[PDB]
Amino acid sequence: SGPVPSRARVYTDVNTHRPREYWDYESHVVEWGNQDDYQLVRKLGRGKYSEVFEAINITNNEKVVVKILKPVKKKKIKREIKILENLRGGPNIITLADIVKDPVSRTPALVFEHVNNTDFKQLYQTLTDYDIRFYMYEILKALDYCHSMGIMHRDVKPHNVMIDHEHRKLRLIDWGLAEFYHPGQEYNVRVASRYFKGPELLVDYQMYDYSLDMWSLGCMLASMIFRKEPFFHGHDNYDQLVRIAKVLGTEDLYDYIDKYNIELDPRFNDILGRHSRKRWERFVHSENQHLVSPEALDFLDKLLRYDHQSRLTAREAMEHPYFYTVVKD
Numbered sequence: 001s002g003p004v005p006s007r008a009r010v011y012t013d014v015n016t017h018r019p020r021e022y023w024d025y026e027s028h029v030v031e032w033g034n035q036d037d038y039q040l041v042r043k044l045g046r047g048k049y050s051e052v053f054e055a056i057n058i059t060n061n062e063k064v065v066v067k068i069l070k071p072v073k074k075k076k077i078k079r080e081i082k083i084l085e086n087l088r089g090g091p092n093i094i095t096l097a098d099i100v101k102d103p104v105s106r107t108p109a110l111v112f113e114h115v116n117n118t119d120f121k122q123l124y125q126t127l128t129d130y131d132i133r134f135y136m137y138e139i140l141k142a143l144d145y146c147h148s149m150g151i152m153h154r155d156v157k158p159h160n161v162m163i164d165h166e167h168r169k170l171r172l173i174d175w176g177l178a179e180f181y182h183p184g185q186e187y188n189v190r191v192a193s194r195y196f197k198g199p200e201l202l203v204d205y206q207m208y209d210y211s212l213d214m215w216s217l218g219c220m221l222a223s224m225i226f227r228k229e230p231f232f233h234g235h236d237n238y239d240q241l242v243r244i245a246k247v248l249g250t251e252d253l254y255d256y257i258d259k260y261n262i263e264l265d266p267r268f269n270d271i272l273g274r275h276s277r278k279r280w281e282r283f284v285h286s287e288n289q290h291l292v293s294p295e296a297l298d299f300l301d302k303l304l305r306y307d308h309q310s311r312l313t314a315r316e317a318m319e320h321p322y323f324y325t326v327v328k329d
């Protein structure tokens with residue numbers, strides 16, 4: 001008879017108590033840098049709505065990355081910009097070193113610090129058990145910081161986690177989907193990579209929060225220790241939830257939907273079927289045991305939970321024994 005509302009259990013009113021210019025990006029006035037200080041070197045990846053290039057600051061010969069914002073909606077540009085500024089300086093948060101525009105065209109471009117990212121398409125291998133705990137911990141720092149600042153990343157995935165292994169340097173990037181958290185707001189469930197979409201999104205529950213991001217984190221932790229990227233590999237959004245259900249089980253999935261009085265599509269109930277909750281051990285093998293430990297499994301199990309309200313906060317996660325060595329260090 002109607003979805004049960006929900007609210008973040010932590011940092012719930014973080015933006016409510018701040019000045020109106022902090023989250024009101026629509027009124028944010030941008031200060032422009034000088035476009036002529038940069039020269040594009042080569043195109044990297046791509047994207048819909050943006051063109052990313054490796055570049056060089058002609059003033060200091062320093063490498064930099066430039067994201068040209070293609071014709072879209074100024075609000076979206078204002079949102080990412082305001083967010084990037086609000087987070088500037090945060091631990092492991094990509095640094096927005098400048099903002100420029102074509103004086104004639106008006107086409108906006110975001111200049112970021114450069115990261116000599118180690119090729120991930122085949123790197124998470126040499127990554128030792130300690131390397132994972134370390135980087136996971138570092139990713140946690142960024143999340144707790146951004147969440148602390150009332151902001152949801154919404155696109156946590158391996159591609160948005162730049163890593164310069166040689167320098168043990170990590171950065172969380174592309175805040176293109178990030179949004180400000182305001183208790184009781186209904187958000188767009190169509191964010192984040194499919195393999196990293198949380199149950200809440202998959203069942204169309206819109207009143208979600210920061211917890212979306214630890215689920216995505218949990219997915220990354222899984223793929224990393226079990227050496228299966230992506231861990232949950234669905235064909236489409238519907239199948240994505242089936243992949244999760246085959247691991248976490250259907251009973252818990254149904255208690256969750258029941259709890260929030262969520263209505264699922266009829267056909268969806270047919271494809272979910274019936275599955276038992278499998279034990280994580282079931283996924284460990286000779287090629288990934290060195291990365292798996294009891295602590296890792298306990299931590300992962302506390303991240304990957306249907307009910308977003310029951311997931312660990314980034315802060316609580318940084319306290320898990322899995323990180324004993326890292327912290328100690």
Ligand SMILES: COc1ccc(C(=O)Nc2ncc(-c3ccc(C(=O)O)cc3)s2)cc1
Pocket residue numbers: 044052065067094112113114115116117118119162173174175
């Ligand atoms: C193989 O060596 C490599 C060295 C460097 C790179 C590379 O892309 N470096 C990069 N450094 C920073 C990058 C970056 C890309 C997008 C965004 C955003 O917020 O949208 C922010 C920062 S990309 C890629 C490969």
